[PDB]
Design a protein around this ligand. Structure first.
Ligand code: VSN
Ligand code: MG
Ligand code: ZN
Ligand code: ZN
Lengths: 185, 72, 929, 113, 187
RNA sequence: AUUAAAGGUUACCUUCC
RNA sequence: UGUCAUGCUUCGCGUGGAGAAUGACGUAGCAUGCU
RNA sequence: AGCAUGCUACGUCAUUCUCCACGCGAAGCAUG
C-alpha cells in the first residue's frame, strides 16, 4: 500500500461502495467495474516490481552477513581457542591441573612430559627460593598432586648444589634458575 | 565429568596443533597417543592423568602462550 | 585270546612287524571319516562314522608306536576275486600299497580277508574336509594331523587364536610344513595314472582312497579293458584338492635347483619375462591327466568360461617366478628423433603376457590424446626416479619420485561449544545416561599413511575350486539378467561432480573439469576405441580421510587416474544406471529409505519364506583380503551385457585394462611408487556393484557347500534329495552348462534363501527348518567358506540372527528397524545411533561450521535423520529430536537479532517457522511421495 | 563308492572315410546318447584302420557335418565265434568320463577279450 | 524497427484524442479516434516483444562464443605443461646403462621393475628402527641389488642432518625415527 | 561309507531307485 | 592433499500444464437507416 | 416483412499477472 496507484484504486473501490446506494449510482455500474478493473491491473503491475527489489535486497544482505561472519570466524581462530581451553580447564576444577597451572603461572614450569609411572625422570625449573621452600621439604617434592624424591639439583650454570646449601642465608649465593630432577614415589 | 575431559582434550590438542607442534615428530606422536587414549577411556582418573601429561606438554613451551594473561 | 592270537599272527604275515592287538571283530570304529560318494541313490562329500575296519598299529623297535597301520577287512567271495584280479596288474607300481589276501575260519566257514599294509591313520580326504569345513570348536582331526607330522607342538594350540589369519599370521607357516607331503602325493597320483593307462583299467580316482603317504588301495569300482587304453577320471580329485595346494604352498620346492629344498634357489635372468615353457612343463608335470586344454596366455582363450579355467592355473604357477618379472613391459620409441621409454605390454600374474597391437615407432608429433596416454603411464616416472628400499613395509617398492619422504598427518577436529552447552542445559551427558558420546575425530601421526597401506599383507594368492566356481558363476548371472547394458558414446555420459581430483600426475594442472572440456567427443571416442586393443597402466594415489568415526584406525581412499575413469564410464555406466533404477530386486542400490522405502524393501525381502528367520554377517578386511579370482569373476559377469557391441578380443582387452589399472597396479603413497598385491580400489567406477557380485557369489557358494555335505540317506523330502544327486553331477560330472538346472537351483534358492544386498552389506530371510537339517546355509557355513576361499576368519560376534520378524533386521546400513503405528497401519522405520547424531552436532571439521547462525541447514538434515527416534520406547532417545528443534528455533532467533543491528533489515519473508515443527519431518516417512 | 556313470549307449549305423571326401557308404557304427538336446555321438567302431574323418547326416535342411576322429585302438569281439578285429575311434575332444562310459558299456556287452 | 513507428502511431493517437477535447462533438468521431488509438497500441505491443526475444538470444549466443574461446586457451597451457614434463623427465634419464640393458634384451622389451634396480644412480633407504639400520646400512658402505653403495647423507623424519656417529644403541632413543639415508652407486 | 545306506527274520526279505 | 556410487534437504535461473485480466474475428436477441 | 450499417450483449485466436508439473547451477547432510 501507500503507493500512488493504490490510492487511485482505493478511490475507485470507494466509488464501487456507492454502487450500493443510489441504485448503483444511476446504473453506471458496468463502467464503474471496468474502470475499477483497469486501475487494479495497473496497481498489480506496479506491485511486483517492488516485490522483486525486496527479494534482491534481502539476498544481498544475507550474502554480506555470511561473508562478514565467515571472515570474523577465520580471523580470530588462535585468540578464541586458548580462551575456550582455559575456561574449560577452570570449569573442570581438578586438584592436579590447578596445581600445575598455578605453579606455571608463578614460573615453575616443567621441562618434559610429566611421566605417569612408578619410576621415571621429571625435571622442573624452580625460579626462586619461595617456590623451593613451598614445594621442596627435606628430600621430597610435592607436584601435580604427587610426591617425587629428589635425585639431583643443578644450578643455572651446570653444577651439583647440595640440599644443605639451599637456604635463606645462601639465597644470593647461586644463580637462582634451578633445575630439579626427581623420581615418582 | 567424563564428557568435559573428552572435550577439553580435543580443544587442547587443537591449541597444540595451532602452536606448530606438528614440526616435532616425537612430540606430536606422544600428543596424538595421549589424545586418542582419553577419547576411548571409560574411567575418569586415567583420563585426568593423561590430561595432566598433555597439559604439561603445553606448559613446557614458554613463550608460546602468555599464561598470566589467559588466566586473567 | 586263542583265535585272536592266530588272527593277529596271520595279519602280521611274513613282514615280521610287531602289531599291537588293537583289533578284533571290530577295531577303532571311527573318529570321523570323510568320503566322496556317488551312486545311483546318493552323492556327496560328507563325514560319516564308518564302523568296521580291523586296524592294528605297528610298534617300532624299542616298543614305540609309529604311524603305520594294518587294515584288515572281510570281503565277499565275488569282490575278493575282483580285487585280487585288478591288484595283480597294478602291483608293480611304487604308488600302490601292498595287499595281502588270505582266508580264515570263523564259526566253521572260510571267510576271505584283504589286508592293506602300512597305511597312515588318516587319508587325504580328511585333510581336505578338515580345511574346507572348518569349525573352531571341532578341530580334533586337524590338530592331530598337524601334530603327527611335526608341523607344530601340542602346546601351540593353547594360544589364544592359533587359527586366525589376522590375529596370528604365524599359522600360515605351520600349514606350509605340509607342502612337501602334498607335492609327493601329487607326484604319486601321476605315477598311478600312468600305471592305470598302461595296464588297461578304467576307474574314478577319489581323495578317500589315498593315504597321506600317497598310496592307493581301493579297486572295488574299477573295470578292465584292453591293455594300452586306460582312462583315469580325475575331476573330483583335483578340483576338491585345489584350494589346499595354495594354502600349504605345495609348489615351493620348484624355486630351488633340482627341485630340492636343501639346495639354493634358482637364479633367473633379470631380463626374462616370458615363462610360457615353464608353465607348460609345470602343468604337464603335476596335472598330466587333467583333460581340459590349458592356455598359458589368456589372450588365446575362447570365452569367459575358458578365461577363469586358465587363470586359476596361472594363479597357481605364478608363485614360482621372481616378483620383478610382473608388470608393464617397457620399450624404447623415438619421437622427433628423441628417445622415449613407453609401455607396450603387460605380464599379468593371472593372465600371462599381453602385447599392445598399436605400437608406433618413429613418431613425428604428439597430439592431446597421445600426450595424455604417455603422461598417464608409470614408465617414464619410474625410469627417471631414485631406487627405493622401504623397510617399513613388506610390499614391493618400485621407486622414489622425490628426494624427500612426505609424512601426512590428520588433525584433531573442531569443537562446537554452543551446542554442547545447550544440550547440557537440557539434561544430556549425565552419569548413567543411556545415550553418550562415542564418535569423535581421531588424530594421526606421520606414520599413518604407510601403516594403513601395509594391510595388503592380508591378500594372499588363493587358488579356487574351478569345477565349483564355473557353476556358481552361472547361478550368479541369473540375478543380473533383468537389467540391460552395453556401450554408450561420449555424448551420453553423465558426470555428477566435475570439481574432483583427476589423479596423478594430472592433479598438478587442474581438476577433472579441465580434461572433460579440453577433449572433444571425438577425442574421448578415440581413446575408448584405443583401449579396446591396447593396455594402458595408470597410477592411483592414496589419501587419508578426515571424518567422524568410532575407531582409531586411519581410513584411506584410492583416487584413480582420469583415463581409467573416462574409459570405464563409457563401458559400464549404461548397466550401472539400470541396476540403480530397478525396484524389487535382490540388489537394493538406488532405493531410498524415505517415503516408505524401508517398509517396501523389508516386505520384499520377507517374500513367502516359510518358518522364516533373519540373519546377517560381515566381511573382515573385505577390500584388503579379497582374492584376485573373485574380482576377475565379478568383472566378467558385468561384461556379459556386451554380446552385441564387442567381440571377444575387445572384451579381453577391456578386462586386461581393468586388471592393469585397478586390480594390480602402482600406488603413489607418500611420493613413492609401490606395487599393489591385489584387492579392491575405493575409487573404481564399479566398486559397489562388484562388491554386490562378490557378496552374492559367496552366499551361493555357502549354499552349495551346505547342501552337498549332508548325509543324503537321511533327507526325508524326495524333491530335495534328487536336487543333491543332480548338483554333484552338474559340478563334477557335466562339462557343458545345464541351462535347465541353473534355473531349478536358482528358484529353490529364492523360496528358501531370500537376500537383500547393498555392496558388502546383506540381510537374509531363510527357512529355519531347512537350515537346521542342513539344506540351506547357516552362519557356520559362511565361516567355513570364508576360511579357505577368503583367507579370513569370521567370528560369530559380528554376525546376528533374529527369530522374530516383527522386530526387523538388527542392522542394515548402520540403521535399526522398528515397527510403529502410522495412520491406522503399522510400518517399519529406520532410526540411527543417537551417539552418531549428537557427535555430528558437537564436533565439526571446519572452524566456520561452529557458528550456528551461518549453518541452519546443517541441523535440518540432522533432524530429518533423527526424527524416527521420537517413537522409541526409551525416553532418552526421543529427546534428541526435540533438542534439535529447540536449537533450530534458538539459532533463528539469534540470526534475526544479529542482522537487525549490524544492518537495518527485518527479514520480511520467512518460512522457517516450519523447520521447528514436527509436521515437516513426519512427511518424509509417509508413503505418498 | 564312486562308480562310473550309468548311462546306456544306443547303437546306430553311419559311414566314414579316410579323407574329408568321406565315402557315404555304411562302413561304421556309432555309439550315442540321445537324452541331451538331440543326438551326441561318443565313439565310432569300424573294421578299417585308415579312417580319419566321418560324415554325419545333420538333422537340418541340407546339412552335412563332418566330425574328426582320433587315432584308433584295437578290440576283439565275439558276437559269433569270429575274428572281429575291430577298431574304436573316439570323437576328437572327448573328456575322460565319456571314454569311460563307452568303454564300460562296450566291455560289458561284448566281452572284448 | 519498433521505436519510431510506435512513437509515430501513439503521436497520431494523441493528436486524434486532442480533437475530442477541442470540440467533443460528433461522438462517433471520438469512437473512431479511440479505435485508431487502440489499434496503434496493439501494433506497437506486437512489435515490442520480438525485439526483446531476439536481443536475449543474441546475448546468449555471444556469451556462448566467449565461453568457447576461453576453454581452448587452457588446453594450450596443459599441453605445454605435459610436453615440458615429458622432456624434463627424459633429460633425467641415463642413456648409457639404459641402452645396455635394452640392447641385451631379446626383442627390446624389458620389465619396468628392473630399470630402477639396474640403471638408477642413487638409492634411498627408509629405516624404522635401529635393529634394521644395523642389518642393512651398517657402516659407510653397504651392498644391495648386487651393487656397492656409499652412504652420502642421513636425515631424520624432521629433515635434520644426522651424523653417522650419533646412530648408536644408547643414542637411538634420542633420535626421531625413521631415518632416511641417501647413498650413491659406486662406479 | 562294509556287503552303497536303514530295518526284520549279511543267506533271504524289506526300504531308497 | 582432498577418490567412486546412491539417497535426501535448501536457494537461484530455464521448459510444459491450470486460474484471473487486455486486444481484434464469427453467431444469437432487441432497437435505428435505405428499400 | 426481407437486406445492409451503427449501438448493446454471448461462443472461437494473441499479450499481462497468479498457482502446479519438468531441466541447469550453488550449498549442506547421510550411507557403502
Ligand atoms: N570407493 C569407496 N568405497 C568405500 C568408501 N567407504 C566405504 N567403502 C566401501 O564400503 C565397504 C566397507 O564398508 P564398511 O564401512 O561397512 O566397512 P569398514 O572396513 O569401513 S568398518 C568396502 O568395500 C569399502 O571399499 C569410500 O569412501 N569409497
Ligand atoms: Mg574308499
Ligand atoms: Zn583357456
Ligand atoms: Zn561393449
Amino acid at each position: 500500500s501507500s503507493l500512488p496507484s493504490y490510492a487511485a484504486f482505493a478511490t475507485a473501490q470507494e466509488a464501487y461502495e456507492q454502487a450500493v446506494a443510489n441504485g448503483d449510482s444511476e446504473v453506471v455500474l458496468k463502467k464503474l467495474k471496468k474502470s475499477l478493473n483497469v486501475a487494479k491491473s495497473e496497481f498489480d503491475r506496479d506491485a511486483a516490481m517492488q516485490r522483486k527489489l525486496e527479494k534482491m535486497a534481502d539476498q544481498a544482505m544475507t550474502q554480506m552477513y555470511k561473508q562478514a561472519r565467515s571472515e570474523d570466524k577465520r580471523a580470530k581462530v588462535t585468540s578464541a581457542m586458548q580462551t575456550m581451553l582455559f575456561t574449560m580447564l577452570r570449569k573442570l576444577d581438578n586438584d592436579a591441573l590447578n596445581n600445575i597451572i598455578n605453579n606455571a603461572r608463578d614460573g615453575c614450569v616443567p621441562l618434559n612430559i610429566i611421566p605417569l609411572t612408578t619410576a621415571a625422570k621429571l625435571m622442573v625449573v624452580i625460579p626462586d627460593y619461595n617456590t623451593y621452600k613451598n614445594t621442596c621439604d627435606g628430600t621430597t617434592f610435592t607436584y601435580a598432586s604427587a610426591l617425587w624424591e629428589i635425585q639431583q639439583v643443578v644450578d643455572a650454570d651446570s653444577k651439583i648444589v647440595q640440599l644443605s646449601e639451599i637456604s635463606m642465608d645462601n639465597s644470593p649465593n647461586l644463580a637462582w634458575p634451578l633445575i630439579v630432577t626427581a623420581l615418582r614415589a | 565429568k567424563m564428557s568435559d575431559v573428552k572435550c577439553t582434550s580435543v580443544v587442547l590438542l587443537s591449541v597444540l596443533q595451532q602452536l606448530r607442534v606438528e614440526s616435532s615428530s616425537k612430540l606430536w606422536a606422544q600428543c596424538v597417543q595421549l589424545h586418542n587414549d582419553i577419547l576411548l577411556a571409560k574411567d575418569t582418573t586415567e583420563a585426568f592423568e593423561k590430561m595432566v601429561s598433555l597439559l604439561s606438554v603445553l606448559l613446557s613451551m614458554q613463550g608460546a602462550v602468555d599464561i598470566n594473561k589467559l588466566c586473567e | 585270546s586263542a583265535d585272536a592270537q592266530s588272527f593277529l599272527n596271520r595279519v602280521c604275515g611274513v613282514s615280521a612287524a610287531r602289531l599291537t592287538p588293537c583289533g578284533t571283530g571290530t577295531s577303532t570304529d571311527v573318529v570321523y571319516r570323510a568320503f566322496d560318494i556317488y551312486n545311483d541313490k546318493v552323492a556327496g562329500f560328507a563325514k560319516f562314522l564308518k564302523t568296521n575296519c580291523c586296524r592294528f598299529q605297528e610298534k617300532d623297535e624299542d616298543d614305540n608306536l609309529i604311524d603305520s597301520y594294518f587294515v584288515v577287512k572281510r570281503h565277499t567271495f565275488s569282490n575278493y576275486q575282483h580285487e585280487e584280479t585288478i591288484y595283480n596288474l597294478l602291483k608293480d607300481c611304487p604308488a600302490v600299497a601292498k595287499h595281502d589276501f588270505f582266508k580264515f575260519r570263523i564259526d566253521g566257514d572260510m571267510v576271505p580277508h584283504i589286508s592293506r599294509q602300512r597305511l597312515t591313520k588318516y587319508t587325504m580326504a580328511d585333510l581336505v574336509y578338515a580345511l574346507r569345513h572348518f569349525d573352531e570348536g571341532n578341530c580334533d582331526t586337524l590338530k592331530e594331523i598337524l601334530v603327527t607330522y611335526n608341523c607344530c607342538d601340542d602346546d601351540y594350540f593353547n594360544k589364544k587364536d592359533w587359527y586366525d589369519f589376522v590375529e596370528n599370521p604365524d599359522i600360515l607357516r605351520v600349514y606350509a610344513n605340509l607342502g612337501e607331503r602334498v607335492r609327493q602325493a601329487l607326484l604319486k597320483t601321476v605315477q598311478f595314472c600312468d600305471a592305470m593307462r598302461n595296464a588297461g583299467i578304467v576307474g574314478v580316482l577319489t581323495l578317500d582312497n589315498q593315504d597321506l603317504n600317497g598310496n592307493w588301495y581301493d579297486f572295488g569300482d574299477f573295470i578292465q579293458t584292453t591293455p594300452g587304453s586306460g582312462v583315469p577320471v580325475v575331476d573330483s580329485y583335483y578340483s576338491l584338492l585345489m584350494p589346499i595346494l595354495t594354502l600349504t604352498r605345495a609348489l615351493t620346492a620348484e624355486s630351488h635347483v633340482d627341485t630340492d629344498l636343501t639346495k639354493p634357489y634358482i637364479k633367473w635372468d633379470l631380463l626374462k619375462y616370458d615363462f610360457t615353457e615353464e608353465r607348460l612343463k609345470l602343468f604337464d608335470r603335476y596335472f598330466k591327466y587333467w583333460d581340459q586344454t590349458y592356455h598359458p596366455n589368456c589372450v588365446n582363450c575362447l570365452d569367459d568360461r575358458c578365461i577363469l579355467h586358465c587363470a586359476n592355473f596361472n594363479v597357481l604357477f605364478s608363485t614360482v617366478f621372481p616378483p620383478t618379472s610382473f608388470g608393464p613391459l617397457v620399450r624404447k620409441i623415438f619421437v622427433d628423433g628423441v628417445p622415449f621409454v613407453v609401455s607396450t605390454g603387460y605380464h599379468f600374474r593371472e593372465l600371462g603376457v599381453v602385447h599392445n597391437q598399436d605400437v608406433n615407432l618413429h613418431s613425428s608429433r604428439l597430439s592431446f590424446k597421445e600426450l595424455l596416454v604417455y603422461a598417464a603411464d608409470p614408465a617414464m616416472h619410474a625410469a627417471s626416479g631414485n631406487l627405493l628400499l622401504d623397510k617399513r613395509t613388506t610390499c614391493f617398492s618400485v621407486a622414489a619420485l622425490t628426494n624427500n619422504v612426505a609424512f601426512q598427518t590428520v588433525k584433531p577436529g573442531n569443537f562446537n561449544k554452543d551446542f554442547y552447552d545447550f544440550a547440557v542445559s537440557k539434561g544430556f551427558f549425565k552419569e548413567g545416561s543411556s545415550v553418550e558420546l562415542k564418535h569423535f575425530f581421531f588424530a594421526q601421526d606421520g606414520n599413518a599413511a604407510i601403516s594403513d597401506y601395509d594391510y595388503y599383507r592380508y591378500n594372499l594368492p588363493t587358488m579356487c575350486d574351478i569345477r565349483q566356481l564355473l557353476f556358481v558363476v552361472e547361478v550368479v548371472d541369473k540375478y543380473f539378467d533383468c537389467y540391460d547394458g552395453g556401450c554408450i558414446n561420449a555424448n551420453q555420459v553423465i558426470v555428477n561432480n566435475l570439481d574432483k581430483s583427476a589423479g596423478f600426475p594430472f592433479n598438478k594442472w587442474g581438476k577433472a573439469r579441465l580434461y572433460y572440456d579440453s577433449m572433444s567427443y571425438e577425442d574421448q571416442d578415440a581413446l575408448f576405441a584405443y583401449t579396446k586393443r591396447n593396455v594402458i597402466p595408470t597410477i592411483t594415489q592414496m589419501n587419508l580421510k578426515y571424518a567422524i568415526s568410532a575407531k582409531n584406525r586411519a581410513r584411506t581412499v584410492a583416487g584413480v587416474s582420469i583415463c581409467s575413469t573416462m574409459t570405464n564410464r563409457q563401458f559400464h555406466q549404461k548397466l550401472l544406471k539400470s541396476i540403480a533404477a530397478t525396484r524389487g530386486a535382490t540388489v537394493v542400490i538406488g532405493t531410498s529409505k524415505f517415503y516408505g522405502g524401508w517398509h517396501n524393501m523389508l516386505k520384499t525381502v520377507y517374500s513367502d519364506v516359510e518358518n522364516p528367520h533373519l540373519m546377517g554377517w560381515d566381511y573382515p578386511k573385505c577390500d584388503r583380503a579379497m582374492p584376485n579370482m573373485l574380482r576377475i569373476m565379478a568383472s566378467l559377469v558385468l561384461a556379459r551385457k556386451h554380446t552385441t557391441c564387442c567381440s571377444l578380443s575387445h572384451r579381453f582387452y577391456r578386462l586386461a585394462n581393468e586388471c592393469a589399472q585397478v586390480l594390480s597396479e602402482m600406488v603413489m603413497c607418500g611420493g613413492s611408487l609401490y606395487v599393489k598385491p591385489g584387492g579392491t580400489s575405493s575409487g573404481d567406477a564399479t566398486t559397489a556393484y562388484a562388491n554386490s557380485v562378490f557378496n552374492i557369489c559367496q552366499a551361493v557358494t555357502a549354499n552349495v557347500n551346505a547342501l552337498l555335505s549332508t548325509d543324503g540317506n537321511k533327507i526325508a523330502d524326495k524333491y530335495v534329495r534328487n536336487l543333491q544327486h543332480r548338483l554333484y553331477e552338474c559340478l563334477y560330472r557335466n562339462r557343458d552348462v545345464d541351462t535347465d538346472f541353473v534355473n531349478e537351483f536358482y528358484a529353490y534358492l529364492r523360496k528358501h534363501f531370500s537376500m537383500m544386498i547393498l555392496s558388502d552389506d546383506a540381510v537374509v530371510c531363510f527357512n529355519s527348518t531347512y537350515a537346521s537339517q542342513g539344506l540351506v546355509a547357516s552362519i557356520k557355513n559362511f565361516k567355513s567358506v570364508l576360511y579357505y576361499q577368503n583367507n579370513v576368519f569370521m567370528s560369530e560376534a559380528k554376525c546376528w540372527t533374529e527369530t522374530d520378524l516383527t522386530k526387523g533386521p538388527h542392522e542394515f546400513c548402520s540403521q535399526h528397524t522398528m515397527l510403529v503405528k502410522q495412520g491406522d497401519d503399522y510400518v517399519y522405520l529406520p532410526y540411527p545411533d543417537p551417539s552418531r547424531i549428537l557427535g555430528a552436532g558437537c564436533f565439526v571439521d571446519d572452524i566456520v561450521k561452529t557458528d550456528g547462525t551461518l549453518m541452519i541447514e546443517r541441523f535440518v538434515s540432522l533432524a530429518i535423520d533423527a526424527y524416527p527416534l521420537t517413537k522409541h520406547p526409551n525416553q532418552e532417545y526421543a529427546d534428541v529430536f526435540h533438542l534439535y528443534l529447540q536449537y533450530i528455533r534458538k539459532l533463528h532467533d539469534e540470526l534475526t537479532g544479529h542482522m537487525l543491528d549490524m544492518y537495518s533489515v527485518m527479514l520480511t519473508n520467512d518460512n522457517t517457522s516450519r523447520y521447528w515443527e514436527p509436521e515437516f519431518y513426519e512427511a518424509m516417512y509417509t508413503p505418498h511421495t | 563308492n564312486n562308480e562310473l556313470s550309468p548311462v546306456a549307449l544306443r547303437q546306430m549305423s553311419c559311414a566314414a572315410g579316410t579323407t574329408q571326401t568321406a565315402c557315404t557308404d555304411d562302413n561304421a557304427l556309432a555309439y550315442y546318447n540321445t537324452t541331451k538336446g538331440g543326438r551326441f555321438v561318443l565313439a565310432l567302431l569300424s573294421d578299417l584302420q585308415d579312417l580319419k574323418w566321418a560324415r554325419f547326416p545333420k538333422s537340418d535342411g541340407t546339412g552335412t557335418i563332418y566330425t574328426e576322429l582320433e587315432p584308433p585302438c584295437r578290440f576283439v569281439t565275439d558276437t559269433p565265434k569270429g575274428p572281429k578285429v575291430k577298431y574304436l575311434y573316439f570323437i576328437k575332444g572327448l573328456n575322460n568320463l565319456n571314454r569311460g562310459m563307452v568303454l564300460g558299456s562296450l566291455a560289458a556287452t561284448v566281452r572284448l577279450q
